[PDB]
Structure of Oligoribonuclease, mitochondrial:
Amino acid sequence: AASMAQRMVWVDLEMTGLDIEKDQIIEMACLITDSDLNILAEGPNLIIKQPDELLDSMSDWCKEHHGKSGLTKAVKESTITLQQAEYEFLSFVRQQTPPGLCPLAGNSVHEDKKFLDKYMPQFMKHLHYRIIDVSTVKELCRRWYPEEYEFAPKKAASHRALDAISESIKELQFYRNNIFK
Amino acid sequence: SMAQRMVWVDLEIIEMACLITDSDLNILAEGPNLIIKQPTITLQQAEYEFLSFVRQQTPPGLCPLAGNSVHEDKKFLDKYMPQFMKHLHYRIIDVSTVKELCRRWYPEEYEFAPSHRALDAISESIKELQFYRNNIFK
DNA sequence: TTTTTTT
Ligand SMILES: [Mg+2]
Ligand SMILES: [Mg+2]
């Protein structure tokens, strides 16, 4: 009840860039945890089709990283539309969380929220407006617990959405274990 | 030390306020407290006042926006004050993130945690984060 | 325990 309302909706996106006016979502993953960061449910992990012209125009960082990770190719091969992706993610969180009560969670997840607010508004209607930004806790750890910050996880296994989620949960667990009372 | 400062902002016609704290949440400098029309001084002049202020107070690109759910403020400022946001880091210090963790992990303490003026909103946010540091951090 | 990057 209150336990269900204290779940967290962990999301990570890959995009063609950081320009909300032109860039698009190309990968999205979602995990549900309970309030103590135990993974309760693994949602869709989807590569979303976007136009060839947009991928050929990406920044140098995106061209390099999304090419080497295999993401650009998978996007070109994907048959999943933005609208179908949104359908699957909304179906998932409907099954897992009470409407309006649970926050998005992840590293600097406000950026993902900007993109989801634009491109998956029906998904975002299911969520709270507050976020659990693990990078806020990162910045506080850096300032207030610099010794501990030396040992915190920082880098995911890949610049792919599901690996980023996995690392973000592990980083928050590290902060809970090392800098909270 | 200067790289660990924080740029506190709040937006509430829109009223915008800003101030600077050090890493330990001590207020170092009060910035502009201004009123603009939603898109009394123009948006561009307001943006210059805030950008000039943070240029005098923080190193470029290094310091985060801070406040309660300050990602909402950041969405607005990213669109309408992009030259101000260029001076700042892309990470934020979202006090409401610490609130949500307090509510889950420290419910007893949460029960004691901390006007509609923007400067008052900043003051409350700093006090709330200080309460969390004092009561739920190691 | 880590490996200065929101994409
Ligand atoms: Mg990430
Ligand atoms: Mg990534």
